[PDB]
């Protein structure tokens, strides 16, 4: 069972948000098929389901401006939220309920939706070069600064995912300009700086941008 | 119906027992089942089903986890708690409209103290080209989470020109990391030589990590 959400990262206020959930490994004509969102600050809100027979149930505090639809010949169902506001910024999840569990067992990776009038802007990527000022013992720290993008989210890997041990991708901060800034770091042996290549892989899907930056010592 | 999760947060040491409670304002039981479920969520991941129907263990979940209760009173218990269990936990009821999640419970792991390894990074030459200079201070792998970072420029304290973020608790050594960024114009950055980042942490005296412009 696999659920994949799709939709826009940035919607303007008072407009309609439209998300899609694609299902594989299972038919949407069995069970129930839910939408869930997580607001900033981590509170979780159930939105509603569409059943195996096309019948819906909506959260009473959203029933007025929510619609859930489906297409059985695409194994897809769809969330629509009208008259969005900044309070509808959140990460949106689809999930499945079966009568075996009566709980939401399979989820998709979320989709980030920001409601705002601001325009999308891609990040600048600068190296955090390892040096004698970022080394300790035989361990060197190094990373990438991901600066001045909008909206969220940004994702960062290292060496296309080959480097996972030691990585810390920090939460983004909101600068006074309205643009987010992020840094990711990893720790490596200092004796590896001369032989092993280190590359951060910065993905900003809202701007359709991917940036790969090689970081070298000072 | 209202789901009160208690407590809102909870620090436990490795190997000890952690209990999280969830109370409803009306029974979530019908047709011989408790429609109460417990989820774990970590940053950058969907929530994960741990316990369905109040006491039933989801497949591939270690039996260190367990849930009990009926009607309006449910608890989850992790015994013994492991470093990978640092996360937020949620209860959820779908017995009746409106389906609702609990407020959540942030579980922290208590370990021995760990001082931060402090790195400092000067602005890249590529960024200076743009006319802005970011200076970054890293506090790596430290416990407890409380840490203070002050920026000095030629021994002068800085206000209003820096920001910081902290990671969540690491799933392996139960430490936190912290990144701080000082932002200046290229012109201001070129008029000063000593750039310093002073860390106060319980596991340390204060330790100033600095660099000098031009000098190596």
């Amino acid at each position: 069972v696999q659920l994949l959400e799709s939709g826009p990262s940035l919607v303007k206020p008072s407009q309609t948000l439209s998300l899609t959930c694609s299902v594989t490994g299972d038919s949407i004509t069995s069970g129930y098929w839910n939408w869930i969102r997580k607001f900033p600050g981590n509170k979780l809100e159930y939105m509603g389901y569409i059943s195996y027979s096309g019948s819906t149930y909506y959260n009473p505090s959203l029933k007025s401006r929510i619609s859930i639809t489906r297409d059985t010949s695409k194994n897809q169902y769809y969330l629509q939220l009208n008259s969005v506001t900044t309070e509808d910024t959140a990460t949106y999840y689809c999930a499945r309920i079966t009568t075996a569990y009566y709980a939401m067992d399979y989820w998709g990776q979320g989709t980030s939706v920001t409601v705002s009038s601001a325009s999308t802007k891609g990040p600048s990527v600068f190296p955090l070069a390892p040096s004698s000022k970022s080394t300790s013992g035989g361990t060197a720290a190094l990373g990438c600064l991901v600066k001045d993008y909008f909206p969220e989210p940004v994702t960062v890997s290292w060496n296309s995912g080959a480097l996972t041990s030691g990585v810390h991708t920090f939460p983004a901060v909101l600068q006074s300009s309205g643009l987010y800034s992020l840094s990711s770091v990893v720790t490596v042996p200092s004796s590896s700086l001369g032989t092993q290549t280190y590359i951060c892989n910065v993905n900003h899907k809202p701007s359709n941008t991917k940036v790969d930056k090689k970081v070298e010592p000072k | 119906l209202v789901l009160t999760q208690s407590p809102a947060s909870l620090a436990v040491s490795l190997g000890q027992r952690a209990t999280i409670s969830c109370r409803a304002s009306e029974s979530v039981d019908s047709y011989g089942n408790s429609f109460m479920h417990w989820y774990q969520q970590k940053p950058g991941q969907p929530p994960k089903l741990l316990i369905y129907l109040a006491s039933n263990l989801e497949s591939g979940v270690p039996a260190r986890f367990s849930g009990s209760g009926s009607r309006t009173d449910f608890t989850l218990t992790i015994d013994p708690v492991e470093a990978d269990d640092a996360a937020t936990y949620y209860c959820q009821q779908n017995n009746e409209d409106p389906w609702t999640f609990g407020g959540g419970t942030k579980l922290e792991i208590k370990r021995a103290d760990a001082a931060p390894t402090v790195s400092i990074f000067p602005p890249s030459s590529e960024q200076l080209t743009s006319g802005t200079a970011s200076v970054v201070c890293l506090l790596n792998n430290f416990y407890p989470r409380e840490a203070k970072v002050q920026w000095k420029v030629d021994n002068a304290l800085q206000s209003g020109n820096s920001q910081e973020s902290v990671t969540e608790q690491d799933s392996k050594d139960s430490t936190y990391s912290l990144s701080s960024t000082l932002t200046l114009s290229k012109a201001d950055y070129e008029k000063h030589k000593v750039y310093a980042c002073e860390v106060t942490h319980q596991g340390l005296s204060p330790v100033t990590k600095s660099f000098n412009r031009g000098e190596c």
Partner: peptide
């Protein structure tokens, strides 16, 4: 069981 407007029956 099947669900209708939130309630299983």
């Amino acid at each position: 069981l099947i669900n209708t407007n939130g309630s299983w029956h």
